[PDB]
Amino acid sequence: GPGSLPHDRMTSQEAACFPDIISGPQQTQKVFLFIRNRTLQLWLDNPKIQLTFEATLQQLEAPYNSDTVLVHRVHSYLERHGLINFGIY
């Protein structure tokens, strides 16, 4: 339901892949959440073509585009778990 993937809280599936983030300072949790939310919004605005890591990074404003390792992790997590890029190859 509405609680499953809220904009303002990390989930347990995310916790398994980001234990360092969910355990850590709140402001870095907010960075994670912004990246996740924007990546999903980019995908769902155009779910008929592949959303790549590079395209995501180019569409994130500063300062979110600065931590390229974190953006890559979020994008990889979302794609590997099927939340982006289903059916578009």
> What does the H/E/C string look like for 18-74?
CHHHHCCCHHHHHHHHHHHHHHHHHHHHCCCCCCCHHHHHHCCCCCHHHCHHHHHHH
Q: Cα separation of 41 and 58, whole Å?
A: 14
What was the experiment behind these coordinates? X-ray
Resolution to 1 decimal place, in Å: 1.2
CATH code for the domain of 50: 1.10.10.10
Structural domain count of the chain: 1
Domain enclosing residue 81, as ranges: 1-89
Rg over alpha carbons for the chain, rounded to the nearest Å, is 13
